[PDB]
Amino acid sequence: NIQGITKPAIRRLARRGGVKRISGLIYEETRGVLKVFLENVIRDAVTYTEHAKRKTVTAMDVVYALKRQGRTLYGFGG
Amino acid sequence: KVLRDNIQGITKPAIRRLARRGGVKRISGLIYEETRGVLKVFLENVIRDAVTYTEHAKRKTVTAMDVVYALKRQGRTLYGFGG
Amino acid sequence: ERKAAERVRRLREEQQRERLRQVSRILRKAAAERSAEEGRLLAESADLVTELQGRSRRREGLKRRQEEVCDDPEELRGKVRELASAVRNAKYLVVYTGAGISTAASIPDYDLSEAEPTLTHMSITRLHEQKLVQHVVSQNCDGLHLRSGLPRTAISELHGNMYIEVCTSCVPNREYVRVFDVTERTALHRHQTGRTCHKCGTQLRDTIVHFGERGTLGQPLNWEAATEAASRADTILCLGSSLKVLKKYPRLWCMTKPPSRRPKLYIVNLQWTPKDDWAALKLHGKCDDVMRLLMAELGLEIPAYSRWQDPIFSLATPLRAGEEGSHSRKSLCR
Amino acid sequence: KSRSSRAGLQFPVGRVHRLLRKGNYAERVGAGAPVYMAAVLEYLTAEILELAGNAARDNKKTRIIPRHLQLAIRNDEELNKLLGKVTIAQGGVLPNIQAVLLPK
Amino acid sequence: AKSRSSRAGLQFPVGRVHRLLRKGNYAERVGAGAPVYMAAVLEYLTAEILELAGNAARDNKKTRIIPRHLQLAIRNDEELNKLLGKVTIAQGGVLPNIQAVLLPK
Amino acid sequence: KESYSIYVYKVLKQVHPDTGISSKAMGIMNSFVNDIFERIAGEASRLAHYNKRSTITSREIQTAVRLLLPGELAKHAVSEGTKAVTKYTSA
Amino acid sequence: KSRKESYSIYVYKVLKQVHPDTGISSKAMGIMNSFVNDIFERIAGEASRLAHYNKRSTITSREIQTAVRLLLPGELAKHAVSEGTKAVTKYTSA
Amino acid sequence: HRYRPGTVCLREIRRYQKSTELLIRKLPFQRLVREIAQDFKTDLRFQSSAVMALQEASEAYLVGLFEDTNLAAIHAKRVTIMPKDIQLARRIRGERA
Amino acid sequence: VKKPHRYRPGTVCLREIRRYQKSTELLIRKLPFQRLVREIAQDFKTDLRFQSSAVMALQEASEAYLVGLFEDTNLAAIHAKRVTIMPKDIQLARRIRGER
DNA sequence: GTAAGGGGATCTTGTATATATCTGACACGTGCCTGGAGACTAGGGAGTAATCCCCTTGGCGGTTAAAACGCGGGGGACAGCGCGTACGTGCGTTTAAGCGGTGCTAGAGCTGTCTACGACCAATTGAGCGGCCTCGGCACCGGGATTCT
DNA sequence: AGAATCCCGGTGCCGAGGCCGCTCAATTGGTCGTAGACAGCTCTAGCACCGCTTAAACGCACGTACGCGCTGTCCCCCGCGTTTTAACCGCCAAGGGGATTACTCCCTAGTCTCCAGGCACGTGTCAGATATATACAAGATCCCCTTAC
Ligand SMILES: *CCCN[C@]1(NC)O[C@@H]2[C@H](O)[C@@H](COP(=O)(O)OP(=O)(O)OC[C@H]3O[C@@H](n4cnc5c(N)ncnc54)[C@H](O)[C@@H]3O)O[C@@H]2S1
Ligand SMILES: [Zn+2]
């Protein structure tokens, strides 16, 4: 399901990052780093959800998990 | 007596020793001034925080605990000096 | 990998330390000082045995070359006849010199103005004035060769002299013979006599060459005639020099020549030199006795040195008035 | 009559006192601490709103949106240092193109 | 048995940890099993560090642990290095490491 | 639920009278206020604990503001806090 | 002067348990004390935050377990959880 | 005609630096999130706010990483970015030992 | 020319790397560092006093910081197919790290 | 016949290793006192059951824009070569850090008390929160005006 | 000349700002117990100076290996067109599970009494520091032997 992150999407993110030309071996590396990031954040969020004895992952669990890693996010109930 | 222009006391061989411990084999000729500027900025920040901590307690002597607290406030925790 | 399953490093370290300490403390014991029970199976560790045996072999091989090696008088007198025959049959012979020649003058090897020329220098001069010896190369800085009477046109001290001052401002360059030495305040890159010249208007400089310095003068260290003579000569007679420094000059040995075409070298020195294997016939013993026996074999007489025979006094350039007191050594007088 | 009107601030003081009292910070709470709290918070919010309203005026709009808050925070150096680890939803990026990539 | 650490089979104090939890402004009430859990976890961590430190001390033919051995043990293990990632240990030094491109060819 | 929408709107009409705001901006402002409150309160609690005290005065808040806010922001916030405290005490 | 508290008595007992014939110096003791204090502060703060999030006034062993899982990386977390559960079971049964 | 290669690249840079919307499709990101999360606990549920927040955080992280990567590539006197630039940026940032 | 023994440029650099990576001591003289610390401090409060442990802690922290920065700088220098470290390497390291 | 390139022996230098001498710090013992353990009481936090109405998951039919594929060409990455100079190696010279005393005094630390300040609890009234609305601010669609290529 | 982007005119539509009503949380008032402000004393560690011995900092010369500019190639990204696909929108169902309320046992705080574990102080002896003499491991150069010419 990581292949659903198409190549034009990575090109758009690179454009917003200021990048002019992109090599052809960049997309796989981007997929790897995104997978690692998502794994860590979702692991922490699921831990927080399990402690509260729930079955639904709320937005506050994501916010707390992000805050644990020093990636504070505003606009979702912080 | 007032202190003036003591940054020159951090000599070029000392910077070379630090670089060798860092794993550096060849060094340009303009590195020393950059190193001095970076060190000055770091020390400025840490000493300002430590002085604030020691002044809150109505004291006249800066203690090692204040230095440790100021360092930990910047995410640079240090072990072996108390705490 | 599990943390507990990752405890294989403990067995690895145990086996490594066990084997290393066991082999070290077992092979460190001398076989001659070992008992039967502890020493019967010394050869079980074949690789260890050969490794330490080779290490010790090279150790006393390196050690054994650092002591004096001498020949009994019978072999010495047998060799001196062939050496005399070779020198008589020689066409173009050059003579290399080193620290061992002046050792008989109580000069240290690897105050100095009280020294005098020895018998070897007089023998060299007498050989030179008989066409037998043409060019002499030396590495000594004492200057006893100058006091012997050997003409400077046929000598070239490649490391300078302690009795000469030079001035480079003049287009042909100028030299001056000084009775006293100039070596008091000489260091690397600091070549300044600090003394008034004759008429140049500039202070002179010394002539000594230190390690790392490149010779540039031509008056005391002539680098053309020495190379020419070494190229043209068909025989070499080194005396009293270990040749651990002179071996670094390729043109002096004519190393570009094919090995068969190289001149034959007859080393006479106590220790071992790196040119030993290619020696036509090496002699072991004091060079003074060998030269005396050579002269006796050829029938040549024995020149005698006298303190009134020094040519340095005649050739000494007079110093400017008031400049004598700067030096702090013992001058030479007739 | 309110403790906020006794100081001129527009932010609540009783709410801040309750939050400091039941927030597990210390055994006792002073009397003037909520006034100091409200003063500093009011200063910060007023300054941020001033800068955001300026940036909204430069875009010919009468309302503030997260883009203008992002612009105000990122342009000013002090507020950029304060909110350095903060990600603002629907903020965007500051327009910036490197010169070496620009055509000659 | 009287001491609460002896009933739990630990070498770390339970009463002291309970008092520290109570007088620290962490919560209004503190349960009875929290000090035991905390003492067990702290004991596990300290023993795990000390074993590697002792091994590194024995590797150098020394029978006393000094800060260099603690630094070697911490930096040579992946998870202990991840835990103490932003910590400076006085008189510890660094791990020897030379980049391959700088070695003579 | 409780929020600072009422007070932030008052400050907004104080600074820019002819300007409105949407809902997402108000939520971001609320999160900002909560974050700053937590930062200052925690720093003041640590300051009290280090000195073996049991109460949180205005001195704790002032030193926390000095240690947290950067540059001239700290100066202006300190001045406003002192002025407001003096006005509250006198009145 | 006043009596000062440290963890040297326990650290030394654990060391003699693991390596029965090894010593330790004073600087290493200070480093170990700082390590224990740091870990205590981290876990206690995380547990207090977890209690505040769920609107509870009590810190129990569930909070300590969740904080341990959040703060410790891997098999370290697994082994620490097992050890703590063993200790609490032995204490409660006895 | 045919624009010389480089003009459309800057046009798109300006367009996407003067915008605020999201740059990844929503259904595929939700699918990836659920498939990742199924390896921690089966039969999980989500709210739309959780997936929205995850998407925002991920996009911000990737944009910042690309900024650092472009800086690293320029330092090496190039115009195009390569995997080694990403690796250097991630190692300096501390995300990798 | 009287040629003595001489190591090629690069041998002593690697020898020093090993020597200073096998040690734990401090690499800055204490008196100049203390003078610099006091000189910096005199711009926040007048007639201040310092404990010896305070200056020791400051020195330890500063040396650790500089060593880490030099490691990052060396990585940046290698990335650009060079061996020497230059100021732009330090600037790039600090910019990516998050400082400045 | 000549010369360029590969490899073994050698010299040197710096680091590691074995042995003895000694000294200060780690480890063990003693006194004692303060903090932890034992026993009992009361009261509020938390667990358990029950109900509801919100919200998350699932399926379906269009449509339409975004993704995937092919192709050609040009600009950028990369190797290779020449050149100049900046940086490393080593030696002789000059300076200031480090050490061991000698002394003084500010200022940290501890003890007693005594009063002002913060916590607690009952009344009570108003400020902030949930629902509904209404009308304009901004997005959308289309024609033309300026603007880099 | 010419496509891409901003500028102006007219329309629509739902979200922000007001208005109503109400109910809990902030305000009043008094009381009580204790934290900390202040005075005082003491003793210890931080500051200041002095003399000296020596190792590290400093200045300089030489040469060589590295950084930088220039050129050529080739290949691999970018811009454009055409076909394929799946995301997004709007609609409709259904049950899980989050959220609130009521009630009851029991777990924890608080208090008093007593004893033993851990902390401050003291003493000794042994592990690591230091000096000294060897052993060896790697680097740098030379010269002989092999191969294309
Ligand atoms: C270019 C640098 C110049 N350095 C220097 N001038 C400052 O040049 C000379 C020269 O380089 C070197 C002298 O070398 P040497 O003359 O060969 O003396 P060496 O140490 O090697 O000993 C010679 C060997 O002869 C043996 N030997 C001693 N006594 C002997 C007697 N009486 N007879 C025969 N052989 C004798 C010795 O054992 C020794 O091995 O230093 C300056 S420095
Ligand atoms: Zn002249």
Numbering used by the authors:
A (entry chain F): 25 to 102
B (entry chain B): 20 to 102
C (entry chain K): 10 to 119, 139 to 362
D (entry chain C): 15 to 118
E (entry chain G): 14 to 118
F (entry chain D): 34 to 124
G (entry chain H): 31 to 124
H (entry chain E): 39 to 135
Authors' text:
SIRT7 is an NAD+-dependent deacylase often deregulated in cancer, which deacetylates either H3 lysine 36 (H3K36) or H3K18 with high specificity within nucleosomes. We show that the SIRT7 N-terminus represents a unique, extended nucleosome-binding domain, reaching across the nucleosomal surface to the acidic patch. The catalytic domain binds at the H3-tail exit site, engaging both DNA gyres of the nucleosome. Contacting H3K36 versus H3K18 requires a change in binding pose, and results in structural changes in both SIRT7 and the nucleosome.
We proceeded to analyze the complex of full-length SIRT7 with H3K36MTU-containing nucleosomes by single-particle cryo-EM. Three-dimensional (3D) reconstruction to an overall resolution of 2.8 Å displayed SIRT7 bound to the nucleosome edge. In our model, the catalytic domain binds to the side of the nucleosome at the H3 tail exit site. The SIRT7 substrate pocket accommodates the H3K36 side chain securing it in place using residue F239. The map permitted reconstruction of the mechanism-based adenosine diphosphate ribose (ADPr)-MTU conjugate, and the observed density and LC-MS analysis were found to be consistent with the bicyclic intermediate also observed in the X-ray structure of SIRT5 bound to a thioamide46. Instead, the SIRT7 catalytic domain presents two basic patches that bind in a cross-DNA gyre conformation, similar to PWWP H3K36me3 reader domains. Three residues away from F239, the side chain of R242 binds to DNA (3.1 Å distance) at the 2nd DNA gyre (superhelical location, SHL, −1.0). Opposite of F239, a highly conserved SIRT7 loop36 within the NAD+-binding Rossmann fold makes weak electrostatic interactions (4.7‒6.2 Å) with DNA at SHL + 7.0, using lysines 272, 275, and 276. Remarkably, SIRT7 interacts with the octamer face and the H2A‒H2B acidic patch via its N-terminal domain, which folds into three α-helices that extend across the nucleosome. Helix α1 binds to the classical acidic patch residues E105 of H2B with R11, and E61, D90, and E92 of H2A with K12.
